[PDB]
Amino acid sequence: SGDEAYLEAAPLAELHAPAGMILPVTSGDYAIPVTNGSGAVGKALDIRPPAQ
Amino acid sequence: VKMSPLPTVENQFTPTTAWSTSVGSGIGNFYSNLHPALADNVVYAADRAGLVKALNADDGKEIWSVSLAEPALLSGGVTVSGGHVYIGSEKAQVYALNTSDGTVAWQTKVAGEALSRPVVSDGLVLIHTSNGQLQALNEADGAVKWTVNLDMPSLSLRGESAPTTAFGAAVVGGDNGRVSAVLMEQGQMIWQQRISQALSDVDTTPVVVNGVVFALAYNGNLTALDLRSGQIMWKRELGSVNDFIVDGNRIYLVDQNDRVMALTIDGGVTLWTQSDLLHRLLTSPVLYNGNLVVGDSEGYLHWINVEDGRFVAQQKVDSSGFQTEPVAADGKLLIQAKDGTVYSIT
Amino acid sequence: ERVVYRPDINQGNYLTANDVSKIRVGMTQQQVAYALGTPLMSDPFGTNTWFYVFRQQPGHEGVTQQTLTLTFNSSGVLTNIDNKPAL
Amino acid sequence: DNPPNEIYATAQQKLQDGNWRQAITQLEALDNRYPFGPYSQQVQLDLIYAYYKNADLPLAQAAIDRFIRLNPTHPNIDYVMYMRGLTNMALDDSALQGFFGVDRSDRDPQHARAAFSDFSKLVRGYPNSQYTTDATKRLVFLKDRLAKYEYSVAEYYTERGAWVAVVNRVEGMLRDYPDTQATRDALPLMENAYRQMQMNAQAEKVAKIIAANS
Amino acid sequence: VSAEIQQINIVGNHAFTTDELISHFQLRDEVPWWNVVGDRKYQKQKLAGDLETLRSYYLDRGYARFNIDSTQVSLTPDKKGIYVTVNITEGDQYKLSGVEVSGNLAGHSAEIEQLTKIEPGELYNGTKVTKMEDDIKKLLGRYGYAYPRVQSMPEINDADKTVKLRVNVDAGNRFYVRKIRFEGNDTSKDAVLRREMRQMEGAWLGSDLVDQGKERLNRLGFFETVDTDTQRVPGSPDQVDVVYKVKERNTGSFNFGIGYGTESGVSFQAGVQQDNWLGTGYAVGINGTKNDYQTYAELSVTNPYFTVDGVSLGGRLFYNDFQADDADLSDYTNKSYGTDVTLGFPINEYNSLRAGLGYVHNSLSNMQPQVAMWRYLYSMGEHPSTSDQDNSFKTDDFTFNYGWTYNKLDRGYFPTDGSRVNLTGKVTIPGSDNEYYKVTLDTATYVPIDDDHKWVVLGRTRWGYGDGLGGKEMPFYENFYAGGSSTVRGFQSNTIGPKAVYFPHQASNYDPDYDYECATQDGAKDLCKSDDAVGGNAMAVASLEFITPTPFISDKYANSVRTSFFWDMGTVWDTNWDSSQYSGYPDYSDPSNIRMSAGIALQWMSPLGPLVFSYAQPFKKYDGDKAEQFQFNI
After folding, report:
1. How far apart are CA E66 and CA B222, in angstroms?
2. What CATH number is given to the structural domain containing C34?
3. D197 shares contact with chain A (CB less than 8 Å)
4. Membrane-spanning regions, if any (chain A) (predicted)?
């Protein structure tokens, strides 16, 4: 458990609408917001709770 | 919880058993007001099994015996007047038996169970029931005239306030803690007042003297009420279920904790209190030879003096013990234990 | 093969002869939905179309399908209708 | 019995050493003996951390709920959200078949679904938190891991031949999970279902869609 | 300390005697002399169900206008006693004139009329009306009306002691299943659960089908409990998203052991069974032994669904090499292996056939002379001398496999209702080394005697037969056996039945003063009555296990611990025994020598697997039988 497997998830890519076509309206229930990537990833992250 | 031990009592006199006679199988674990009564030197007795017998008051010999059964379930005292014996049952039936032959004069189905002692006054026989329909019966034929509804609490006590009659108004208790007064003319309501205090607040038999009523709730208040107004004049916190006596200017009673007390008629001030019999389930007291006799659940008749309230005699009479109240009349003291046997004391 | 006991396979709406009679050209979306029940499939893409299919495969008998197509304009009034009874 | 900080020191040392079991036996003394005290915060967070590093995932989740109920405002709440996400995710993993490398995609997705919801809440509520990158990557993984289960239901229905189920399931993926690889793999299933339903008007449309994104 | 119900009383009740009424209530005043567990603890909430029971009982005897006038409960002054009085009015009993159904019938008029039909003049019954209401509800559900409005309004014709029943029904809108969901199959593949369903997603709902889904899941045995929830889809009028809630459990046992002084030496052996290997639904079973004098091994793999139609496919592997006294060169040395491949398909919802082909290899050397084996070999045309042990035999045989299994068990691993029948039969392929046919019939019948399914009478029997097809006889190596944990408790494993009769012969690899049977070296010079079991060609075993509730164990063990009394009878015998030549030996021709045993059986589904604890008396043996009273198996 807690393996790095989730880093192997393939990169995401939108489906392109063909000419004269519109794809189904996307549900917002599973959207992905975007922010700065400066944070660490995987085991490099200090999973320990913040200190005082 | 612990219950008080028997007291050491040096007897000033040696009361003796004149006679005793077995009657059926007793009441045993059951609880009811089934007690014997004396009229014209004849002792009438009954038992839950259904046997009803007439006993000579002095010799103790049976004169006649009959069974009304099958669990006949007789209950609610044995009252006698005018040559008839009225006996309730925890089934609807209430029987009126001729004293001479012992055949059933008439039988009537009164609504609900007939726990209370039937009382007879000016040709009407009152019965108070577990469902509150205080009914009245003609002594002659047994047909009902009127019924009165007294509300039923969710949790009650297995006992109903037998009524008492004074100046045409029958005063009767109620399981909801409201002593009530009703005219026997047709059962018209007269007045009603709550006597309970903030659970079970059931009432028992009241008594009236010199125009002032007395009532006594299981919990809350002992009080006196004006017969003509029903207004409460004075009150005390002595709750109980057992019958209590009026004599002279004193009030003798037994509390719900079996502590025996004497109170004044006016103001309810305590004269003395006796507490040795605490938690010894005590029969209602009865006056005899200037003294009060109370039976217990351990078969002891405890005799107590009026003036100080200390014990004057203490004797075993039975192993099963006396739940039902003793009776005293015509100079003879009578009592029957839980077991089916009436004991005559002297 | 057919000899083995496959369970009966039901698919699509329970479109039947009586209710399809109530459909009238030009009728509004809500009442047609009420008449046939909700569509169990609809064209997910740009064309505003409703598809009713009544399909059954009993244990060994052949598949039977009755497909009904409904098209609507931008405001949901039935513009064209066709009812394929079999195959 | 020792005063709070000294016992906390040994507790933290054993936690650092990774002796998770005896470490948590040390941690659980503080909150029971010294509730409401000033140290309650750090002991509780370390308690969440210790349960998570242990296999006691549901107890970690219960503790995280009992924590978040108390202090909606807290400078470290984002960490508790991240730990909630992690303890939801770790319940999706397994030991024996994980070692064998068998994909667990088509099993229960409810845990993965809750993990995605919680991580999305984290990244949308605290976009500047240092854990936001891990939350974004884990959301990327969880979207695919949900769409893979949904596709694996579509696959079974195609193989049985309940074509309406296939069409509805693939439409559901195109509505919720359009961007993922699972839809790109599943569109052939919806094409096949439409053609088996003699629904050529829709089959041509699906053919156009798959052609445009081949 | 608390009060106790000292008397229950009911006024009126002229139709039925009070004792009869109080025979049914949970509240009860007195203890039968033969019972002790009848606690008299009164509780206020407990009386409500009792009063409803009285309601239903009087409604079930025709007293339509029955009502409770009032109920009074009172304490004794001492607080030690409760009396409960129920005051009722019966009235007259009424009989049903007829039932009229009105409303929206949804086109099912014939069936609804059939369900509500009644014989004329029958007494009114509350149970009857409730049954009709529920039956019409489920009938409407069967055609896809999940939520039909049903109302039963009786009309009293007091003028003639009769009642007319008015039923109003409105089916509503047919419901389609939008999205079937599974919650709790953490390990098993979602396909493994969904394959069992009969309600396909995106189709009109069906109460029968969605219930059969639960029924089949419960039969599969991979889950402790299964719950179904026809939750309505929000925002839509007629779509329901059926949800199955499940809970998985262990599905096998992992038995391992090592030899001690009770064995020939310190060596490993194992036995493994698994029904849901890695949650994919495959069934796997392996056995392995490497004893110094035996290297038996066995393996089996079965796919319950080779194709989604239900065609089951599986196979079996086994290997054996056994020596009787030593390793390098030993008496009665045998080597054997075989391959079985099985294909099975369901012929209906409950019956499934099986088919396949089996291949078996057998070799024997240094065989101990005995009547049965040499009779068989005489059948095959071999002529091995009885006086000399230095001879061997070999065989290569292929068999056609078939079988029939009927399964109506209510639950997989602790069944309480239905029965299971399993008929398996083998026939040699023409041209094979052996020419025999064998058929065996197994039957397990569960019937509950109490409605709670805690008292269950288990009727279980096994039967078997076999015979040579040509002039030959069926092979000794494959005979039936009885005794042990499976067939008959008490007796030693594979011990019941006809008993070998050795000839006097010279013993190979002999060593002086070692334990040996019937050797001229030891001076044995006559035919031999012996205690070494040999099995037989035909058998019949029966059992009646009286399953009972676990008496004094908490509910946490309710679904894991089971106990039962039992009575066993069983027999094995040879139809081909020639009794004429062996007057001085037991006549195995007659099956009249039934073995019997009895005892107590305890079953515990421990986390590591099922545990069988058995203690029994073989209260009717026959000569030559061996038994141990207490026997244990995993």
Report:
1. 43
2. 3.30.1450.10
3. no
4. none
CB atoms within 10 A of CB C74: 6
Quick one: resolution in A?
Answer: 4.0
Nearest Cβ partner for E309 among C6, C11, C38: C6
The CATH number assigned to the domain holding D65 equals 1.25.40.10
Owning domain of residue B248? 1-346
E214's CB contacts (< 8 A; 6+ apart) are: E226, E227, E228, E244
Residue D42 and residue A52 in contact, taking contact as beta carbons nearer than 8 Å: yes
Separation in Å, CA E155 to CA E124, E150, E158: 11, 16, 9
The letter for the amino acid at B109 is K
Go through the domains of chain E in sequence order and give each one's CATH number: 2-93 (3.10.20.310), 94-173 (3.10.20.310), 174-250 (3.10.20.310), 251-634 (2.40.160.50)
Q: Does B256 touch chain E (CB under 8 A)?
A: yes
- Domain of D42 in residue numbering reads as 1-214
Q: Count of B–E CB contacts within 8 Å?
A: 52
Closest CA relative to residue E634, chosen from E318, E315, E252, E314: E252
CA D14 to chain centre: 28
Total domains in the fold of chain C: 1
- Closest of E35, E34, E26 to residue E5, by C-alpha: E26
Residue B239 and residue B221: Cα distance in Å, rounded?
6
Structure tokens belonging to residue B175: 């399981």
What three-state secondary structure class fits E269?
Answer: strand
Strand-pair category, E436-448 with E418-428: antiparallel
Cβ contact, residue pair E75, B281, below 8 Å: no
CB B114 within 8 A of CB B127: yes
What is d(CA B77, CA B326) in angstroms, rounded to the nearest whole number?
Answer: 11
Cβ atoms of residues C71 and C80 within 8 Å: yes
DSSP, residue by residue, E87-130: EEE-----EEEEEEEEEE-TT-HHHHHHHT---TTPBP-HHHHH
Name the residue type at position D131: Y
Q: Assess if residue C4 is contained within a domain.
A: no
Residues of E in contact with D167 (CB under 8 A): 202
Binding partners of B (≥3 Cβ pairs within 8 A)? E
| H or E, element range at D183 | helix D181-196
CA triple E91-E97-E99, angle to 5 deg: 115
**Experimentally determined by:** cryo-EM
Chains A and D touch (3+ CB pairs under 8 A): yes
| Cα A26 to Cα E531: distance, rounded to the nearest angstrom | 80
Bridge partners for B119 per DSSP: B126
d(C-alpha B218, C-alpha B237), whole Å: 10
The angle at the Cα of E525, spanning E519 to E529, to the nearest 5 degrees, equals 80
Does residue C3 fall inside a structural domain? no
E310: amino acid identity, one letter: G
Domain count across chain D:
1
Q: Return the residues preceding each gap in chain D, C–N over 2.5 A, or none.
A: none
Q: Is the residue at C5 inside a domain?
A: no
Range of the domain at C60: 10-87
> Facing residues of E563 across strands?
E548, E602
Whether C2 maps to a domain, the answer reads no
**Which DSSP string do the residues of chain A spell out, in sequence order?**
---GGGGGSPPP-PPPPPTT--PPPPPGGG--------S--GGGS--SPP--
Contact E216, E198 (CB under 8 A): yes
Q: Of all residues in chain C, what percent are helix, strand and coil, respectively (each to 5)?
A: 15, 40, 50
Report the C-alpha gap between B211 and B228 in whole angstroms: 8
Nearest chain E Cα distance for residue D132, angstroms? 29
Q: Which two tokens stand for residue E590?
A: 């007659």
Identify the residue whose tokens are 């509240």: E27
